[model samples]
Target: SIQAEEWYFGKITRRESERLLLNAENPRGTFLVRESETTKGAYCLSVSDFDNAKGLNVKHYKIRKLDSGGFYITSRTQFNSLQQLVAYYSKHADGLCHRLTTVCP
Candidate 1:
């Protein structure tokens, strides 16, 4: 989760990022690492939300996973899991593509 966050929010090029993903024990495991890209800090979708909810398409939210096994959105909004956050944000649109959601799909 640490390097993934660094590669993600930091300036690690796609080449190096790809290398890490490829080198990981489970290529898919690297895919599991994630953090909110919205805030400069890691964490976004985890700690926030909406209702009946019209998706916030204007600013698609990227919900990411933390090393702690919890998800987050904007740090202040730490979600227990990615599903609830994704489900909440995705209500308006079916699987919207954001920095966070894109990683999953």
Candidate 2:
């Protein structure tokens, strides 16, 4: 079972042409992930459903991504285990990990 705060946050890309919101709630049509508030370091994966009267109500599918030889699920339901961390996410790639996969020519 996952804990209340154990939400999954994955990777999202931002371009130099874009301006950062500096808030957890990213711009519409954009997918995002945030740094774990607590330690041993983790990510909170989520996507906006709609601009609610307050903030958001993330009730979406288990967002996943492909790894070299494994799979990754939204941290929204991962407390028993932890996913790896990524440094930088690129606008070119959807996921930060994907950006790292193939860059430059």
Candidate 3:
């Protein structure tokens, strides 16, 4: 198992935002630390989607993680719409990438 932590911030679409507000107890995002068998003394960060049914446009939602003494923007797609953002992230975050989503608003 991995050590996980999550945080939610920023503005989101009205519907999505409202959904998150309703489920305030649920984590919007998650960060996991796993021991790497390939790398000694190193831990890997694993991020995952939280709510799949909120209709929050995972693409437009900007997500990031900071740990192991470093910080970075996980999502790199540049788009003006939430739909595009979701598509970009879905395609980009196939299976191996770490920077999972982007921050909303």
Candidate 4:
């Protein structure tokens, strides 16, 4: 069993995730974390938004784990848990396409 988090949606396929994020209800920066289907021990950070062209877009960032048991989207930043990771990105976009907004409902 995996730890529970409001934003964590385990075992959802990439296409299923895209549909959720594409919903008009979710604002541009709404996001969710899902278990990666193809890669064991990996996760994906999927965010809903649009580009300057006004086209809908769902951006995904691969989250990888370190040998020390931390999670990171980019090696430069790491956190002890996905909670911390989401917290950090929620404050600022940093390297992410968008700063995390609402967790998928």
The best candidate by lDDT is 4
Query: What TM-score, over all chains together, does every model reach?
Result: 0.27, 0.26, 0.23, 0.92
Sorted by lDDT (best first), the order is 4, 1, 3, 2
Report how far off residue 70 is in candidate 1 (Å): 1.1
In angstroms, the error of model 1 at 20 is: 30
* Candidate 4, RMSD to the unseen true structure: 1.5
Quote model 1's TM-score: 0.27
Per-structure clash totals for the candidates: 13, 8, 10, 0
Stretches > 4 Å off in candidate 3: 1-28, 50-105
* Alpha-carbon deviation at 22 in model 2, angstroms: 12
**Highest-TM-score candidate:** 4
* C-alpha lDDT of residue 82 in model 3: 29
Better of 2 and 3 by TM-score: 2
Give the C-alpha miss distance for residue 54 in model 3, angstroms: 16
Q: Flag the better candidate by TM-score, 1 or 2.
A: 1
Candidate 3 on 1-105: residue-level lDDT in tens?
Answer: 012222222222334443443333423333233333344443333333444574322222222233433322244333443234334544565333334343322
Q: Give the distance in Å from residue 75's predicted Cα in candidate 4 to where it truly belongs.
A: 2.5
Instruction: Let me know the TM-score candidate 4 reaches against the reference structure.
Output: 0.92
What would the per-residue lDDT of candidate 2 be over residues 1-105, giving only the tens digit for each residue? 223223323232322112232235444324344443442233443333335585533422232333433224543322223333222222233432233221111
- Candidate closer to the true structure by lDDT (higher is better), 1 or 2: 1
